Amino acid sequence: AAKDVKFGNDARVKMLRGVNVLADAVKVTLGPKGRNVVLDKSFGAPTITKDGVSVAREIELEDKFENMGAQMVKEVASKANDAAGDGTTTATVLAQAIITEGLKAVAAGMNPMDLKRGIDKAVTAAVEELKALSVPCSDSKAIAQVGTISANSDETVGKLIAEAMDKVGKEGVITVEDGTGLQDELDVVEGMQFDRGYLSPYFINKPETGAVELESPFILLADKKISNIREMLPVLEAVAKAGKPLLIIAEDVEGEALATLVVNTMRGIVKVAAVKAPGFGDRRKAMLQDIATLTGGTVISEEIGMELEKATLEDLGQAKRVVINKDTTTIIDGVGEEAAIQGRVAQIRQQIEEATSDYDREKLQERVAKLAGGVAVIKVGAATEVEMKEKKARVEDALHATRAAVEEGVVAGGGVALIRVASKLADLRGQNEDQNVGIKVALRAMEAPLRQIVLNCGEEPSVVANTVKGGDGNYGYNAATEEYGNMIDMGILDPTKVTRSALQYAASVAGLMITTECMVTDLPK
Amino acid sequence: AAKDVKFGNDARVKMLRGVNVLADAVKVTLGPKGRNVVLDKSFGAPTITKDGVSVAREIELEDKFENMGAQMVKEVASKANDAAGDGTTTATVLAQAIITEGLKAVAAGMNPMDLKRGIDKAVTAAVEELKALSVPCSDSKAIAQVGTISANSDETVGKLIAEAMDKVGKEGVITVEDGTGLQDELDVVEGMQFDRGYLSPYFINKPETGAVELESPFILLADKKISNIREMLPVLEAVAKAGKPLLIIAEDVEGEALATLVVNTMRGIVKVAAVKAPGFGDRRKAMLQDIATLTGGTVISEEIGMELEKATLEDLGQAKRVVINKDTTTIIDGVGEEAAIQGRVAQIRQQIEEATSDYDREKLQERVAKLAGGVAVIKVGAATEVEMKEKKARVEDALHATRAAVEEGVVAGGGVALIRVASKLADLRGQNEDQNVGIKVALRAMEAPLRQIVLNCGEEPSVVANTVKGGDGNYGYNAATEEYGNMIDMGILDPTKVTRSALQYAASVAGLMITTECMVTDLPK
Amino acid sequence: AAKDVKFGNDARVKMLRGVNVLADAVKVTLGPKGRNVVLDKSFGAPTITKDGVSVAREIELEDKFENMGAQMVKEVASKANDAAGDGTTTATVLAQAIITEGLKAVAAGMNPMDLKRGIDKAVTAAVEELKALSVPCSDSKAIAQVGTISANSDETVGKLIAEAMDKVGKEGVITVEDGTGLQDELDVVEGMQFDRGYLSPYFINKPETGAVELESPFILLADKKISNIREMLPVLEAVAKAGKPLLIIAEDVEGEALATLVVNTMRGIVKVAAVKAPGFGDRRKAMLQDIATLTGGTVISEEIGMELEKATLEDLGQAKRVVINKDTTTIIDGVGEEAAIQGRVAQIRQQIEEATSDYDREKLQERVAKLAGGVAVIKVGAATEVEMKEKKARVEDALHATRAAVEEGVVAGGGVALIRVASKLADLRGQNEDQNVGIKVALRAMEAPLRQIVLNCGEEPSVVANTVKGGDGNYGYNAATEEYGNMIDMGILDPTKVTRSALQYAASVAGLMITTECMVTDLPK
């Protein structure tokens, strides 16, 4: 259709207004003292929340161009979220600060590319600096502490997460489920995990979860593109008569077969979840054989000769519970016999022994690791279902934070790491004047997080920011108690990885955002 | 004509808008670092200035309600200027802060009477506190220093003012003059000062000066009311032949006579200035006799028998110079015989000796004081008339500041003394909640001048205010150097009297403002 | 009346619009390749012109904001022109460039007063740099060359100015006059100069000349304030009988006497021009006595006793000619006896010998200089009256340029000297970021004049500016020949004084306008 186009400073100010609207919408909820925000519901009561992610997913603007700026900040915030799992408000605030300053500089007539280059230099310097300032979290006690603070200061959740972390090692797989008894339970059962996502979002049985949980499902293994709907018809009849959930792992799924499965899920007669084949080529087939071993299933490939039509209920594997996340998938207690799994472990281990390629050897090593380590299973213990699910969600976010911190590290919360980095790197210069201006933009930009936190606390942001700048080390201003002190001593912490990713994504989005001219759109009808 | 009436919250917010407009327009120029402001001029180039008084005298609003609010806040600011001579901007800023907060509270529904009483108590406490915090300035050294800083850090002006203060004693009279030579000149000649102004503003021959300077005039003493201008008809004809300025000291002058003389001055054939007779009854007559002795004049009174028509040129007194300020008038080098003046001094001396009533002794004592001390005159010395004018203005404002300081005292400049007072009086509680709220309003409101100066310096208001509050004694913040330190060391000081009067007038105007409900005004045509 | 107020970015952008409008209007005509502009004329065909002052003096906006913007820019430019005489377009262009950049930076949140301080540092550095770069013009040949350049490549005018300069010495004064003969005439007669102008513009007999030229006028010497019209009635009748122009030199002129002189000149019964007395006090009286000696007049003073009423035709002086300039005035061939003038010169010489005050000695020295050296008159030689007038104007402004060059010096023309200055001062760093930014603004600012000149030549400005920047010394770009080369060789050079003053005034006005926010205006009607 006829598409409008505007470019130059006018488009820049429009997109600036849009991102400003979104930033004002989301920044309020930052911090403990982040104020409540009320969001719509087409029926019934409006919802009340302090979670910025809901605000981001629910916000869009009537004006096209402002809406598009809002979408830029929204998608980069979501990228940060899926990268780490928290701190989305922090990333959005950083983005607003950097982008507002960059636009006002561009209004001053500076060269945009020089500003972008200076920003890139400043942000990479900050990344390496905070990497230096990172503190390892390998010790169990700090893991318990971070899990505690993430779960609204619940020490039991931290203890359980730490124990599970011990059980399955540093890079194990942990899943949480509902426990019947009032006491928490923990058990290591061999399972599987791999990074693949659902074919369509429509498979999500619990939209709030964002994932598909299936109990006692039947798993289909395939190394072929599922061109036609006639291929899986016997399997569909089989799972219809079985009356149980169905999981599919295929090299590819076409739009038509997926759409038919979507129609089937809306029919509710059969609930089908489909995922892509992990790995590539030979390695893909090798872990497909691993899955067949784990579930007692059979691998169906075009090259060997068998097809999906020649599929029986026996041919498919099985397991006790599978979860299909946004881009991950895990399986728990595959029916496949442990002895066959051990034989496969030995085969892959001797393959490692004869391995000469480094990357293939690493693939085999991680394959045996995921195959032998298994999966830890938490079972939430409480009285009523409401607190069952509350504890479940708290455990989920806590373990996400814990694995994030374990992966990279941890620093003092309150954004104090950012301002400390700013004080350290204030002297960093650029090749030319405009690059230096962008450097200064970045250096004064990451004061915004604690500033907005203080604003949500009601105190004057500038005074507290100056006070923190005066202090050194891990000294800052507890928002909850509204008093100064060392965050580490009082348990306030934040993973290094989440802050690093947030800053990187904010810098990247701002760099591409400032350098845009032609904000095209469709005719407003 | 027709008129309307407005009242309620809408009325108060109208007042608030008007006073806010004027307060911003003037406060932008506060401080030595005060921002410039551009003023109209129907003919030729517009003016650019930093003086708040110029801004104040040229503000009126299209809307009647905003206009009247601005008019009355401007009026009280002018009252403050008349009290001391400086600190108009500070007074207006104080007024803005207090009225804004108080009307906010009035919107919050608290009893306005309670707030007025609370702020009255708070301001009285602050006044006595700053009186306790006053520092004497009787020594010539501090006199020279304050005169120096007042005259744009000109030590020669301060030295001259100190010398004149020594010459004419603690409560002497000092008058500025243009000196022919390049060297700065000082002299002492018997003059005569009294607290009466011109009857009509039209008399002001030098409106920028705001006074009437007449050289070698004829002075007419009249202890009667000027019922008709025919009483003046003969004598005026005489001064038409003399071609010299004319001064009249009259017990009263009826409005029609004033109009006739104003017409005669618009024609300017006769340069007539009239002033009401100070004193009261017997005191007025005795001091008029003193005037007759001083100038060689003669008192014309109805009861004794002589009349104004029967007045000759020789009957009028004379003096080498006279100046008529807005509410004061001084005379320099009265022609009248010094021996006769000394005889009159002796006569009033025996009157003091025989005087038993306290106020009779006081009035006779001040009479002999003003009769014997004379007037010290400082004549500017330089090569160019431009420097003559600027140095005249500098010496003028400097000696007003010096006498203000001598009258009561001197304290730290920049309003830091107000901050110290507020810190001292943070404990004062009202009889009930609302009175205490008003007290809080007052004690947090006198922080405004420092904040405004910080804005005029571009620094963070809250940060600097907190820094000053942390400090004790006179530890303030030199704005010119932009450095913290003891205020007296760099010597930026202010008279106690001017700050006290400004705060008192701001308190009064805010108190009456809060209890305002109804404006009656002409329809906007 | 009720006034509107505006403050903040709205005020700044209004000012920006006004300055941009006038800057285009004035900068269009820069260069010998400058364009043409036609102005209003209520009757007859309007005037096409090229002069910067001609276009500038009629510029004003219907919108009051932009109007007063243009007003103060125009007035600063005009007083800069009064200082030197030329470079009006250059001053306006410099002001526009600096203020546009400064307001852009202010819109970028830069601290205004810091920018002003950086501008101050930059301009003082530029002044010292250019004065170091100045080239003396004491040699007569360069004086003739610059006179030729100013006078549209007329070597005769520059030559004649050179011989006149020789006749009256380096610091002499030369006045142009109409010459009867085809050959130009030169003479030296005992003239007089003093720095006082007409009391009102209405005395200007030739508005284009901007002065009051009176042939054979009677001179009235007065050392008193002329209070009333009654005093000069007898002299008015005497000069009406004489049927000749009248000049008054008076200590002070009142408003009413001035207005009556104005209406009497509009009646034209008497063509009287009044001027304030030069100097101050004793020296004023002494050189007034010198005037009486020179012209055969007599000094009338109140102190001595005689009155202006007691004035006869003999008492008044006389001279062959007088010209009251804007702020100075000249007299030609006073009637007073030469022997008396020489005796007075000797008397003042012995006063110099006994003079111990340095400044008084300098005053006496310049007194004897202006009394003895006199004035050289150049009488234009040509055939027809049109060339009489045009060559008279050419001689006048060429002499102005020549004296301007003599006072300070001369540097490379076409603004290339500014480019060299900027290159020399590229390294100057401010105390902080904002001062440095202002310094950069200033350094790029004085490139605009050269760019504008190139634009008025039609060539691309940036390439020529870069070419000049690469070149060193005085290698500039002759606009007329449209080619590069050493600026001195073709001799297009500019006085150091005019450029210095123009840049200083532009910096002053720009700094003032940057640091102002509030702005009043009358109601729009």
Ligand SMILES: Nc1ncnc2c1ncn2[C@@H]1O[C@H](COP(=O)(O)OP(=O)(O)O)[C@@H](O)[C@H]1O
């Ligand atoms: N007691 C506290 N001390 C320091 N920072 C806090 C405290 N409580 C909340 N915060 C701030 O909240 C920020 C993020 O809060 P979070 O609950 O993750 O919101 P979001 O999920 O939107 O990022 C952290 O960066 C942290 O600085």
Ligand SMILES: Nc1ncnc2c1ncn2[C@@H]1O[C@H](COP(=O)(O)OP(=O)(O)O)[C@@H](O)[C@H]1O
């Ligand atoms: N550098 C400075 N340091 C401290 N005080 C200052 C400075 N500049 C101005 N002030 C304070 O501001 C007050 C008012 O400033 P002033 O220029 O007098 O405005 P106004 O003439 O309207 O009173 C003064 O009492 C003075 O003490």
Ligand SMILES: Nc1ncnc2c1ncn2[C@@H]1O[C@H](COP(=O)(O)OP(=O)(O)O)[C@@H](O)[C@H]1O
């Ligand atoms: N051929 C040229 N070469 C170099 N400079 C020129 C030339 N023509 C004009 N200019 C420059 O233009 C400036 C202003 O020219 P002028 O005619 O004086 O305009 P204005 O009267 O407005 O100052 C001068 O300083 C001069 O150096």
